[PDB]
Structures are given as structure tokens and as C-alpha cells.
A paper describes a structure:
Two main classes of methionine sulfoxide reductase (Msr) enzymes catalyze MetSO reduction to restore the unmodified methionine: MsrA enzymes reduce the S epimer, and MsrB enzymes reduce the R epimer. MsrB1 has an active-site selenocysteine and is found in the nucleus and cytosol. Both MsrB2 and MsrB3 contain active-site cysteines, but MsrB2 is present in mitochondria, and MsrB3, the focus of this article, has distinct splice variants targeted to mitochondria (MsrB3B isoform) or the endoplasmic reticulum (ER) (MsrB3A isoform, hereafter referred to as MsrB3). As anticipated, the MsrB3 structure has the characteristic Mss4-like fold found for other MsrB proteins, consisting of two highly twisted, short-stranded β sheets. The cysteines Cys3 and Cys9, in the CX5C motif, were found to be disulfide bonded to one another adjacent to the zinc-coordinating site and far (∼21 Å) from the active-site cysteine, Cys126.
Human MsrB3, lacking the signal peptide and carboxy-terminal KAEL sequence, was produced in Escherichia coli as a fusion with maltose binding protein (MBP). After cleavage and purification, MsrB3 was treated with dimethylamine-borane complex to methylate lysines as described, since attempts to crystallize the unmethylated protein were unsuccessful. The treated protein was crystallized by using the hanging drop vapor diffusion method, and crystals diffracting to 1.87 Å resolution were obtained. Though the amino-terminal segment containing the CX5C cysteines did not exist in the search model, phase information from molecular replacement was sufficient to allow building of the remaining ordered regions. The MsrB3 structure could be built through residue 137 (numbered according to the mature protein sequence as in Fig. 1), but residues 138–156 were initially not visible in the electron density. On further inspection of electron density maps from the full-length protein crystals, a segment corresponding to residues 150–156, most likely arising from molecule B in the asymmetric unit, was detected, making interactions with symmetry-related versions of both the A and the B molecules. In addition, electron density corresponding to a sulfenic acid was seen for the active-site cysteine in this crystal form, with the hydroxyl group oriented toward a conserved pocket rich with hydrogen bond donors and acceptors. In particular, the side chain hydroxyls of Ser72 and Ser76 as well as a guanidinium nitrogen of Arg124 are all within about 3 Å of the hydroxyl of the sulfenic acid. Though no substrate was added during the preparation of MsrB3 for crystallization, the sulfenic acid modification may have occurred as a byproduct of formaldehyde addition during the methylation reaction. The fortuitous modification of the active-site cysteine may help shed light on the mechanism for stabilizing the sulfenic acid intermediate and preventing it from engaging in unwanted reactions before it can be cleared by reduced resolving cysteines.
Author numbering: -3 to 138
The structure:
Amino acid sequence: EFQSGSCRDKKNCKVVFSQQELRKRLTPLQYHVTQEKGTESAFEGEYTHHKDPGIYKCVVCGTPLFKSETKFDSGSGWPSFHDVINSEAITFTDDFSYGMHRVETSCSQCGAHLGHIFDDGPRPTGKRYCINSAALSFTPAD
Ligand SMILES: [Zn+2]
């Protein structure tokens, strides 16, 4: 009666890298977050206080995820966006850890763990995509 598994669990990701390639190409924190559903510490991420115009992509596979124009300061300690470039890029699953309910967000293309989505976001969506800095790469606007 709930949603579970990324495309890695289902062994049907469109993009698959070997763990060996990812160990070299990602920092230990980026690897832990995206590959082991880790969470960076509050305010650990470069992109938390970062307001330059551009596009944030999945740090693993490069799929575009978030526009700078939806980024906002949630005071939470992690990057926060009120919308996604398009929802087909995200796998939403139910997270029941710690005796609470949250919706985890993962990349639908490679399965990377990104973060969570909450209902305390600003207008116009009311959504907060709460995303690890270490799950993202940033491409500055032209
Ligand atoms: Zn990805």
C-alpha cells in the first residue's frame, strides 16, 4: 500500500555506472549520499547558500532536476526548491524511518538518492524539495 524502491532496486535504471567509476568520480560524501541514501550534515553543502542563476542536475548522471528560479531559503540546512524541472525525473517513495513518514526523492534515471519532498513549501506549489547539495551539480546560466 506504499511506494518503495529506486530503479536500482528494480534493476531497470536507464543509466548504470559501476561502483568503481562512481568511487573515483564522486567525493566520498557525494558517493555516500547518492549511492547509500546518506544525508549531508546541516549546512554542509556548497549549494545551500548559493543563489547564482543556472540549472542543478543529478550529480551522478546529469539529468536536469532543479531551476535556480525555484530555489528558496528554507532555513533548514539543505538546498530547497519549490518545483522540479519535470516530475518524470524523480522517483518518489515512502520513507518510514525513525517512526515517521516522509517521501524520499531519487533520480528516476540512475536511482541516485537526492533527498525528500515536503508540504511546507512556498507558493505557488506549496512544495519543498529538500535536496542534498552533494546530490547535485550546478551549471551556470549562459
Ligand atoms: Zn541520476
